[PDB]
Amino acid sequence: TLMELLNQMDGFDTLHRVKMIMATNRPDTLDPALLRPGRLDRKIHIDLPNEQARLDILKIHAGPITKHGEIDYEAIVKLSDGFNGADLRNVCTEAGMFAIRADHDFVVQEDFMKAVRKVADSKKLESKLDYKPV
């Protein structure tokens, strides 16, 4: 079933306006014949957010949130080390959870850092997150 792909990717019949997008987690477990250029042209590398990236995504999820004019995104990023976009999304979720705690419809800044501590604590179970390309 894979060799059908290998054929009908390059094979005899060429292709036109047919774009192939592939997604994975570890490239190391793939077939080199599939990994050679021509079939799989370019390998785009995605990595964890930098500091500015973390600040940006944080601002992204931070938009539609009933809060106060008190948000220190910078400190949260400072405690923010290696977290997925879904991770920061998790932070925004948990901070709202603490807000539901005590039933304060607004959002205080401290619940942010608390949720950051919780989520960051939760990452004591994820090892081997990197994989060599190819």
């Binding site: 930098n50 500091e51 500015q52 400072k78 405690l79 080390d81």
Partner: protein, 240 residues
């Protein structure tokens, strides 16, 4: 592959490998830091950022720039335990040099001592190999500035400018295209290049507080640490 206890102790693999030390090199990578060193025409400079996530955490108690002697500066990576334990070794045999031979120790020679000491940590099969890295700089008579890198593997070599930490490949890529193009190196030349390479690899545009800058130059051989005032002076200096 795994055979016997090659995965566990300092022995040979069937392929002739040993997995422990190569486990140790990435053991430096958990430090979450990247260091940079450069040698100039008559000066050499070290620089590396820091992470201060706590307001309760002091500032002066975070430095990795370690004064070994009045004319020897060094910087560390890896784990703070192995680094600090490395420190008293360096200082200790450094003084032993002065006691035995009178004059001052060569920075290359001290690297010889450290690498030789680290040799047994891999050599014996009943001792942890101290997974940290070592960086040295210093002025030499009839030789100018010098920079060296000691490794947990137990070898060293001279350079002209080198970085370490987590971004070895990137910083080396930047420096290779940066230096080999017939670069004349002044003081602020080497410095400005030092800040620029790091600020490009990390894309920071840092405040003058986070990073640290060691320096030695042949006008005052005393190893000198930079103050954030002058550091900011150079920061705005490259800030056109």
């Amino acid at each position: 592959s795994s055979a016997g206890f090659d995965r566990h102790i300092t022995i040979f693999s069937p392929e002739g490998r040993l997995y422990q030390v190569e486990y140790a090199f990435k053991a430096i990578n958990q430090g979450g830091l990247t260091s940079v060193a450069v040698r100039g025409k008559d000066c050499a400079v070290i620089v590396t950022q820091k992470k201060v996530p706590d307001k309760l955490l002091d500032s002066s108690t975070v430095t990795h720039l370690f004064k070994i002697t009045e004319n020897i500066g060094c910087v560390m990576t890896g784990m703070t335990a192995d680094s600090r334990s490395q420190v008293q070794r360096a200082r200790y045999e450094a003084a032993n040099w002065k006691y035995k031979y009178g004059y001052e120790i060569p920075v290359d020679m001290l690297c010889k001592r450290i690498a030789d000491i680290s040799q047994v940590y891999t050599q014996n099969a009943e001792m942890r190999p101290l997974g940290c890295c070592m960086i040295l700089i210093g002025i030499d008579e009839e030789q100018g500035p010098q920079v060296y890198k000691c490794d947990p593997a137990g070898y060293y070599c001279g350079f002209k400018a080198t970085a370490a930490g987590v971004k070895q490949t990137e910083s080396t890529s930047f420096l290779e295209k940066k230096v080999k193009k017939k670069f004349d190196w002044t003081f602020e030349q080497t410095v400005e290049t030092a800040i620029t390479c790091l600020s490009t690899v990390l894309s920071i545009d840092f405040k003058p507080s986070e990073i640290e800058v060691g320096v030695v130059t042949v006008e005052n051989p005393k190893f000198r640490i930079l103050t954030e005032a002058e550091i900011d002076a150079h920061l705005v200096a490259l800030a056109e």
